[PDB]
Amino acid sequence: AEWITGTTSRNFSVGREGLEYVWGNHEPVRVWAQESAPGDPHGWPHEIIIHYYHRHPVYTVIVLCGVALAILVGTASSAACIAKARRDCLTPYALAPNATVP
């Protein structure tokens, strides 16, 4: 609630639930914010990133964090498995130096 004199602008945050403002003796005015974020959900991936960042910031941060963690763990574990199998194929041939590898 604010008592206002003069010509000054006020910023109010509107969500999906809504916002009702009464100005003077006028009837209450109800507004609802639509999900009109900049970007494009159907396009290149970056536009999707800006769109869902402006809509739900923490949600898209944790989703991309999960994606980055998943790809990092997947590549690291696959590389570890390939390295272990490559060692398991090599060291039978490494203990015998004069042996001819196929």
Binding site: E17, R30, W32, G39, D40, H42, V73, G74, I82
Partner: protein, 438 residues
């Protein structure tokens, strides 16, 4: 036919559904909450206002003494002074030099203007939601005033509606409320007979005309040190006025869920907070058999210019061929997209346009026309208008708010990670069989 579903508590926003009895044609059914009524049970404690602090004429007895008995007047205060010498217009008032007793007298009462400017203290309890329901089924309408308690039917006889218990209890009023001139405040007032001077509720009575008025305003009768007849008094400021200083703002401008407070039964009107389970016993006269309903030989939906917003943004046209001309229920079988129209008119062949509101970037949903199932697929653009003056008809869902392109990207990355897992374990198994050979 007993049909059970769940409607939102939002005023307006028609909730549409089909009742599909097996042997009969699908029947449209939409329920609209026209109004809501949180009416708590209120117990009246007292009425307060500005006191009058009326002081009667000073009673003097000279060459004598006085004492007063207890009185039922509000905030009784006697005091005896034994050295006065009153001087009205025309010299001294009686005939003794020094020993002169004056009874200073003070008590409070309601002001003459408390019939309007008064505050009523109320204690509330759990509130019962009463909702007005506009239910249309087939071509018939019904207006009901149901209770949300979960057992009481609606006041319409023929259509039996049980509005189940609402998911969350809201109760915008705290346990103690104060009503002044149509404005409602959540104030923790003092209890009856538990007054405090200078705060709200200095003076208390069960009614304006009641004679059982109680008060403990801190009044102190000072000693008259002037020639002229006087009752000097020091009193606390009116706590009703002090509350009018710091009343804050009423619940008409503070209450959650955007609902307005009225004072004649003290009800909260149009609170959009929870979900109401509802069960309707539709009479069998509304249902018609599948023979009399037209059947759709072929249906296909093509949707153009869809946009996910509160308004019905998006036009899907059904191209259809049907044998018999008639009327047909039309429905959207997704909780994300809702159609504007419930019934259409079907000819032998043609196309009907329909408007829907969705909350998903993709318009992949099932639309039904005289039963039937057609699937609609499109990419829906984000809205250009930032803010709209009408609420959203549908609620967001996690599986729908994520677009199909984004779903393909995340599933491609996750499937790539999983494929690296699978090839790692496969080559590990190959190493295992090689070390079994060794």
């Amino acid at each position: 036919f007993e049909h059970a579903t769940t409607v939102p508590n939002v005023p307006g926003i028609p909730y549409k559904a089909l009742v599909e009895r097996a042997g009969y044609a699908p029947l449209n059914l939409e329920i609209t909450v026209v109004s809501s009524e949180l009416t708590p049970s209120t117990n009246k404690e007292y009425v307060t206002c500005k006191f009058h602090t009326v002081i009667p004429s000073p009673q003097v007895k000279c060459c004598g003494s006085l004492e007063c008995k207890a009185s039922s007047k509000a905030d009784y205060t006697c005091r005896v002074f034994g050295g006065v010498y009153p001087f009205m217009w025309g010299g001294a008032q009686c005939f003794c030099d020094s020993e002169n007793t004056q009874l200073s007298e003070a008590y409070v009462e309601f002001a003459p203007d408390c019939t309007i400017d008064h505050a009523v203290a109320l204690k509330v309890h759990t509130a019962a939601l009463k909702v007005g329901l506009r239910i249309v089924y087939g071509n018939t309408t019904a207006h009901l005033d149901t209770f949300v308690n979960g057992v009481t039917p609606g006041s319409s006889r023929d259509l039996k509606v049980i509005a189940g218990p609402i998911s969350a209890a809201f109760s915008p009023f705290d346990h103690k409320v104060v009503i002044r001139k149509g404005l409602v405040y959540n104030y923790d007032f003092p209890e009856y007979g538990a007054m405090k001077p200078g705060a709200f509720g200095d003076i208390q009575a069960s009614s304006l005309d009641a004679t059982d008025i109680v008060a403990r305003t801190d009044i102190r009768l000072l000693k008259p040190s002037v020639k002229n007849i006087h009752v000097p008094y020091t009193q606390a400021v009116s706590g009703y006025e002090m509350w009018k200083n710091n009343s804050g703002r009423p619940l008409q401008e503070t209450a959650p869920f955007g609902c307005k407070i009225e004072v004649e039964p003290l009800r909260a009107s149009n609170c959009a907070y929870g979900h109401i389970p509802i069960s309707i016993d539709i009479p069998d006269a509304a249902f018609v058999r599948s023979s009399e309903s037209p059947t759709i030989l072929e249906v296909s939906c093509t949707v153009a210019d869809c946009i996910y917003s509160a308004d019905f943004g998006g036009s899907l046209t059904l191209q259809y061929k049907a044998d018999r001309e008639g009327h047909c229920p039309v429905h959207s079988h997704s909780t994300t997209a809702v159609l504007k129209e419930a019934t259409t008119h079907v000819t032998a062949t043609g196309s009907i346009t329909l408007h829907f509101s969705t909350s998903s970037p993709q318009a992949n949903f099932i639309v039904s026309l005289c039963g039937k199932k057609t699937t609609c697929n499109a990419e829906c653009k984000p809205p250009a208008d930032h803010i709209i003056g009408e609420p959203h008809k549908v609620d967001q869902e996690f599986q729908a708010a994520v677009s199909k392109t984004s779903w393909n990207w995340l599933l491609a990355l996750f499937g790539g990670a999983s494929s690296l897992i699978v090839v790692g374990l496969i080559v590990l198994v190959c190493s295992s069989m090689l070390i079994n050979t060794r």
